[PDB]
Target: Nuclear autoantigen Sp-100
Amino acid sequence: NSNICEVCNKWGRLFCCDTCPRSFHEHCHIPSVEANKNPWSCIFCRIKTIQERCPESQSGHQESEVLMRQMLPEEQLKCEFLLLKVYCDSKSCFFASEPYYNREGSQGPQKPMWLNKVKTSLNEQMYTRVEGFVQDMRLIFHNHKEFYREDKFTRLGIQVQDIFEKNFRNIFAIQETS
Ligand SMILES: [Zn+2]
Ligand SMILES: [Zn+2]
Ligand SMILES: [Zn+2]
Model:
C-alpha cells in the first residue's frame, strides 16, 4: 500500500485498501473509513465494481437524465466519489470551510456554500436526487466568481469547477460532445 493519503498526500494514521494499493486518512475518505470491515475496499474500488457488474453503465448519458435520478445507494456512492475527487485537488482548500465576505465593492452571496457543508449533507442523506448535490457543488464556484469580480483570485473558482465538471462527466458517463 501507498505510505501517503490518496486525497491530501500527507502521511499519518492511514487505513489501507484491501483491494488496491491506496491509503487514506479516516476523514479524507468519503464516506469516513468504516470502523471494522475486514477486508475493506476503498471508494475507488467500489466504483470500479459497479462498472464491472454493469459494463453498459459506461455508455453515454444525458446530463438531464442523470440529474433527475433519485439518490439510491449507487448514486449516493457516485456523488461521494465525485466530492472526494474535488478534495483530491489541493486548491479545494479555498472551498472547504465556511466562507465570509467583506470586500470593498462586493456583497456576499445570498446562499453561501462550501465543501464540508456538502459533505455533511451527503452523510445526513439530505439530497433526494443527484440534482441537489450537483446544484450545491456548482453554487460553490458560482458564488466565488460573482464575489471576486475582476480580482484574479476568481480563477481559483474556474480551476476547481473544471475538476468537478471533468469528474462529473467521467463518473456519470456523460455522452461526449464537441
Ligand atoms: Zn488525507
Ligand atoms: Zn481500493
Ligand atoms: Zn448490466
Remarks:
- The radius of gyration is 17 Å.
- The CA atoms of residues 63 and 174 lie 6 Å apart.
